[PDB]
Symmetry: C3
Subunit: 185 residues, 3 copies
Amino acid sequence: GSHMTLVLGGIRSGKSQYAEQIAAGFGKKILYVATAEVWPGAGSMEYRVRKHQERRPKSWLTLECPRHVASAVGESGLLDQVDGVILECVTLLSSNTLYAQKDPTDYEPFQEALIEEIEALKKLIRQSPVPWVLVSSETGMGISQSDAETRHYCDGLGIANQLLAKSADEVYFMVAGLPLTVKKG
Amino acid sequence: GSHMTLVLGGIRSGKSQYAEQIAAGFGKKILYVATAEVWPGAGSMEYRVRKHQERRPKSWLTLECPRHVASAVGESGLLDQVDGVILECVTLLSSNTLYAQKDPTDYEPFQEALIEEIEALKKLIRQSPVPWVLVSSETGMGISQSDAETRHYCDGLGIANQLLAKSADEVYFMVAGLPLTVKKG
Amino acid sequence: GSHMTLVLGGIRSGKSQYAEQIAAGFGKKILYVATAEVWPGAGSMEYRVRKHQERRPKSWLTLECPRHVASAVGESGLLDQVDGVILECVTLLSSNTLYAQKDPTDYEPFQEALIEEIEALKKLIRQSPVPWVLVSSETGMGISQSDAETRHYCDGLGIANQLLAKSADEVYFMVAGLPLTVKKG
C-alpha cells in the first residue's frame, strides 16, 4: 500500500533484488525506468545490462532515460498503462547529471540540476496513478575526500537521497541483502 | 531527557540538522561548540561556516575551539549560562588532532591524543549541568586502505565514536536524513 | 540459541569484540578460526595478531587457515572438541582468495572461488554440532571505483556477505560498537 518507496544501500547490498520484489508486489505489469547509458569500449555496463534485460519478466516495460527522467516518463504516457514503476537508479541519474555539466569540479551547477531532476520526480510521483519504488546508493560512509568531483558527487547524491527519503512513504536501508526499515507509515 | 546524545552518519546524511533539532529541544539558549578551523586559500571551509553562522538562532552562543575542547568549554564557564550544548564536530576534532602530530603516518601519538580529548569530553559531560548532543561521522564502511594517514584517521575516529557511543544515553545513526535509533535508555 | 550468527560492520566498529562476546556465550572452549596471514616486512599484521593471541582466553583453540577454510576446519576434527566457533574473518578470506588468483583485475575467477569457499562454509556450518559466529566487514557504502581490483573485491565481499546473511540465523550490523539487529528468528 506504499505509494512511494526508497530502497538504498551499498555496493552489492541486495537493493535491486529487494526493490524488484517490492515492484512485483504492485502488479504484473511494471515500468522499469533505466537511467544507465551503455557505453562502447572499456568500462561499459553492457554485460550487466544485458543480463538484467534477459532476467526481466516479460510483462514489464522498459524505458531508458538517462536524464530529464520525470519529463520522459510523464510524456511517455506509460504511467496510465502499468501497475507500478521501479526507477533504477538515482546513483546513475546523479552521475549523468554531474558529467553533463561543463566543469564537474564546480559544485553549484551540478547540485542545482540534480535537485531539479529530483523535484520533478517528486512532483510526478505525487501525481502518479500507480506506486513507485526507487533504488539509490549510500556512498557517504567511507572516506572520499581526494578530488573535488568525487566530493561533489557524494554531497549531491546525499542531498538527492534526503529529498527522496523525505517524500517517500517507506524507506529501506539494505545490509547484506536484508532490509532495515528506516521509515514506514 | 537524554543527558548525552551522539548523532552520527555519513556525508550529507542530515546529521547536523537532526542534532540541531535535538539541541533546540534543550532550550532557547544553546552553546554551539565549533571545532573546524577556517583556513585561508583553497580548500577553505569559510563559505559553509559563514552560512552556518548566518542561519544560527540569535540566542545561541558560539565557541570556536579546534583542540583541547573539554578544557576550553569548561574554562569558558558557559555551561552555567546555557540550556544545552551541541558539539560540531568529532570528525574535525579528530582531523585537528591528527595533523597536530609530528608524523601523521605514526598511529600511536595521534591515537593517544585523540583518546585524551575524548576522555576529557566524557568527564566534562558527566559533570555538566546541561545536556549535550555531539555530531560525528561514520567513515569506516568503505575501502580506505591507500595511505597510512587515512587508515590511521579511520581507526582513531572509529575508536572515538565507540567511546562516545558507550558513554552516550542516546545514539542515532542517520540514513538519508532519517534517524535510526541505535541506543536509547 | 542461535546456530549461526553473522556480525558485520565498518572499520573499528566493535564487531570483533561483539562477536567474541557472542562466542563466549557458547561455552568455555571456543575454536578461533583465523584467516589472516602474518607477512614479513612492512604492512605486516604481526603486532595486532600477537596482541589478539595474548588477550585470547586460555581455554580457546586457534586454527590458522587463510584458505579452504571449511575443508581445514572439518578435517581438523576440532568441531567435536569445542563448544562453538568464531570465524575471524570473511574480509581477509576474500582478500586471500582475490590475491591467490592469476589476475586480480579479472572478476570471474575470484568470484567463483570466493563463492565456493562461502558455500563450503555454509555446508559445514549446517552439519556442525556446535554454533558459529562469523565476522565480516561492510565495505560498500563509500566510493571505491578507482581500480578494477578494488571494485571486484567490493562486489565479491558484498556477495559473500549476502550468502552468509541469508544462511545465518542472526545478523548484527555494528555502529560505533553497538549492534543493530538486522535478522533474528
